[PDB]
Ligand binder design. Structure first.
Ligand SMILES: Cn1c(=O)c2[nH]cnc2n(C)c1=O
Ligand SMILES: Cn1c(=O)c2[nH]cnc2n(C)c1=O
Ligand code: NA
Ligand code: NA
Lengths: 307, 303
């Protein structure tokens, strides 16, 4: 089996965090264990929400149970939105130990920090997490999925073009991860302003022992709606597809993105049908269960360009 | 869509409570929402375990979030192992309101209280819960899945035979639930000493009673009851007026999961060697196909 330790948020209603990542990965045959970092009624995008949060001591306690039972052996660790520094610090110590047990362990990290909605975006998490991500998390990460804003904060350099983005990706590689994917863009696109850019870069040592790097690009059609959990789903699927195609970033990224496409298209349709009228957050909840078939064998609806 | 609110335990490693009921129900297309009554590193059958418990106040606030957003509309509610009196009490108040919100809501309840090994009965929860189950839970439930021991405790009458079991089930029906299934019993089967009898009764007035003779296994699995209730919910949903088929698919599904689980357990633990709780964890993920369309391997007989 292939074991994944996913430490993310949980909601009763809806799909974000572990709710967005668990079903798909289970459907794909992964033994995914879910540590819920928070338990809320629904995501914070709704008008109302209530719930509890897990603290760093409780996380450590849970890991103790696993350790005591000699069940602290994983192939992958997967994290995303993290709200607290001591929690993030604990996540770091846990990954560090799991990597000692298994040096081949792959840590997939979605470095959630914030986004843009003008020019100079804003953060979604305490600023004191940035230094921890820079000095502790990223260095341990093997695969990261920052958006442009996050790539800039992590690298400490702004991005105004594709070449600058690639330079940032090289900087991020030097910080630690062999696979870097700047998930969202807003860089010029030959197809217009209705498209966003996805850039991916993967460094690996081939059979002959040569260290090479593969770079790809995708121009994805934007959507006129605010979805939640897509980044969590993107990271989970990237994990799954790079696992299946370890030396082919292109195919891995094309399947990840296509899976997202099918889920979002189905979600958009159902959302509209449930009215007209801008759908509510509830109606825009990802149609995960209904996308089982697309998750298993996604029809490739987009092709990446080689860089 | 068919929404299900499942209030059960959560474990990081393994499959029990919500871990045993969610994946299968999702695979089957249900929009199941999971309220984790606890979050443990693994079930209590291991040498060690750590975790936290959700208290009744936390359950209420989580529900408040749903209510405030008008997301308190469910087609089903699913509960199982509960340990606190106050938590269970909070659970009935919620089902109470959810039923007020949706009169057609079906409440599937697995009355976890205890079980009888050799002959004597052992309790799994504080006895201060029995009164709550009898007086408030069961009366609210529409489908219950007690083993023989639990049925005896709920009805207050002992069972020594099949017809006494059916009379107890008639008693449980009068208490409220239209569907009653005795998932496990000490009753004898002509199939041999290695089989146990399962009895089901559904009211809809017409009554449908069925019987299944199931093979036993010299191994202790955790989460099977949780999975049984989830699947019974799923299949009774697909076949609402046919307890016979709903139970054959439910039991057939468990068979495939346990069969696969036992084989992998022995493969990991050499022949002759008794598998550990870790090796005995249900092989849920690998049973996706069996959950979607279970090959029928057991026939129920209409009584
Ligand atoms: C996007 N998103 C959310 O909106 C959210 N809300 C609560 N947890 C959450 N998590 C983990 C998340 O990733
Ligand atoms: C059988 N069983 C257990 O033994 C257990 N232990 C902790 N949660 C548990 N749940 C939800 C359960 O169903
Ligand atoms: Na992101
Ligand atoms: Na039981």
């Amino acid at each position: 089996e292939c074991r994944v330790l996913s430490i993310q948020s949980h909601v009763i209603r809806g799909y974000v965090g572990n709710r967005a990542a668990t079903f798909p990965l289970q459907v794909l045959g992964f033994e995914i264990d879910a540590v819920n970092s928070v338990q809320f009624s629904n995501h914070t995008g709704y008008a109302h929400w209530k719930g509890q949060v897990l603290n760093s001591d409780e996380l450590q306690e849970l890991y103790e149970g696993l350790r005591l039972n000699n069940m602290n052996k994983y192939d992958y660790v997967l994290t995303g939105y993290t709200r607290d520094k001591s929690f993030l610090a604990m996540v770091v110590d846990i990954v560090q130990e799991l990597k000692q047990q298994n040096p081949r362990l792959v840590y997939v990290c979605d470095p959630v920090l914030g986004d843009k909605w003008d020019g100079e975006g804003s953060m979604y998490v305490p600023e004191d997490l940035l230094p921890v991500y820079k000095e502790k998390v990223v260095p341990l990460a093997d695969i990261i999925t920052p958006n442009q804003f996050e790539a800039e904060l992590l690298s400490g350099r702004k991005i105004h073009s594709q070449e600058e983005a690639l330079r940032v990706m090289d900087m991020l590689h030097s910080m630690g991860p062999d696979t870097v994917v700047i998930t969202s863009s807003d860089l010029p696109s030959p197809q217009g302003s209705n498209y966003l850019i996805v850039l991916g870069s993967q460094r690996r040592r081939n059979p002959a022992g040569s260290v090479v790097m593969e770079r790809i690009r995708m121009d994805i059609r934007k959507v006129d709606a605010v979805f939640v959990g897509t980044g969590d789903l993107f990271a989970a699927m990237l994990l799954a597809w790079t696992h299946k195609h370890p030396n082919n970033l292109k195919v891995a990224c094309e399947k990840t993105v296509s899976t997202l496409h099918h889920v979002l298209q189905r979600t958009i349709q159902c959302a509209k049908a449930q009215a007209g009228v801008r759908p509510s957050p509830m109606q825009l909840e990802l149609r995960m269960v209904q996308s089982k078939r697309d998750i298993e064998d996604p029809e490739i609806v987009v092709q990446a360009t080689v860089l």
